[PDB]
């Protein structure tokens, strides 16, 4: 199916304590493949997936230069934005950047994206056409005019429609044994009485990849949200993901309920019931 490549950067100012903390991570779909951490000893972009380790010295040198340059730009930007907002030098502030590209199952470009935040709020974003920006507030209108003068959208679009998709295609081929394999969920169900009249049914999905999944409880074949609890999809720590969905049911009526599981690794959705 479809695939994505995304980079996430976070810069945090540290008032009265020198340089900000800068962390960069890169992903192909839900798999991290590179990192840079300003607090780490190497001061290099480092590998985080086996299939990127084959890239040569020139690749690691250029990636390191890219992320170091972005960290320097962010450190200046933290001070510039503090000025646009008339904030004091006392507080810690954060800049976040996300960018990346999506390709279809045939490897062709689908969409590109670049968005930035300041203190957890939207600051500026590249529009869908990759030719203009949307500023979230008046401070961001100053940045928008600078970026128009710098032809920043042309640079972003050239990267997103070019190098981004070409390198994503190379990574998908080099790491195909893991990146292009789906791991369907392994499902099970538990039952826990709560009182002499109700019980919790919990539907589990474990060991799946990619992370996108849908768990839905139905009662008499009708979707139900009342008396349900769905936890956020979480990482197992081994490259796979987990999720559960629970419903509180009257004891004696468990057979009215079914858990429906949808995932890319399943050609047909699963339907689980408490007893056979």
């Amino acid at each position: 199916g479809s695939h994505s490549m995304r980079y996430f950067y976070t810069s945090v100012s540290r008032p009265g304590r020198g340089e900000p903390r800068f962390i960069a991570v890169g992903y192909v779909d839900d798999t991290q493949f590179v990192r840079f951490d300003s607090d780490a000893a190497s001061q290099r972009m480092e590998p985080r997936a086996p299939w990127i380790e084959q890239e040569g010295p020139e690749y690691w040198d250029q990636e390191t230069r890219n992320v170091k340059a972005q960290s320097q730009t962010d450190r200046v930007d933290l001070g510039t934005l503090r000025g646009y907002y008339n904030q004091s030098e006392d507080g810690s502030h954060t800049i976040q950047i996300m960018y990346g590209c999506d390709v279809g199952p045939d490897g062709r470009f689908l969409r590109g994206y670049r968005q930035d935040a300041y203190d957890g709020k939207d600051y500026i974003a590249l529009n869908e056409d990759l030719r203009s920006w949307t500023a979230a507030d008046m401070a961001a209108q100053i940045t928008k005019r600078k970026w128009e003068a710098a032809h920043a959208a042309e640079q972003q679009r050239a990267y997103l429609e070019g190098r981004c998709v070409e390198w994503l295609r190379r990574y998908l081929e080099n790491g195909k044994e893991t990146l292009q394999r789906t791991d369907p969920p392994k499902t099970h169900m538990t039952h826990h009485p709560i009182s002499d009249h109700e019980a919790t049914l919990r539907c589990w999905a474990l060991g799946f990849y990619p992370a996108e999944i849908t768990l839905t409880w139905q009662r008499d074949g009708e979707d139900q949200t009342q008396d349900t609890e769905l936890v956020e999809t979480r990482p197992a720590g081994d490259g796979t993901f987990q999720k559960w969905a629970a419903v509180v049911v009257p004891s004696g009526e468990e057979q009215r309920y079914t858990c429906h599981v949808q995932h890319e690794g399943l050609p047909k959705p699963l339907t689980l019931r408490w007893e056979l």
């Binding site: 980079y7 960069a24 890169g26 730009t73 930007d77 970026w147 920043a152």
Partner: peptide, 9 residues
């Protein structure tokens, strides 16, 4: 492959 272009805000 990360982006190589940056310009001040």
């Amino acid at each position: 492959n990360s982006a190589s272009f940056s310009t001040f805000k």
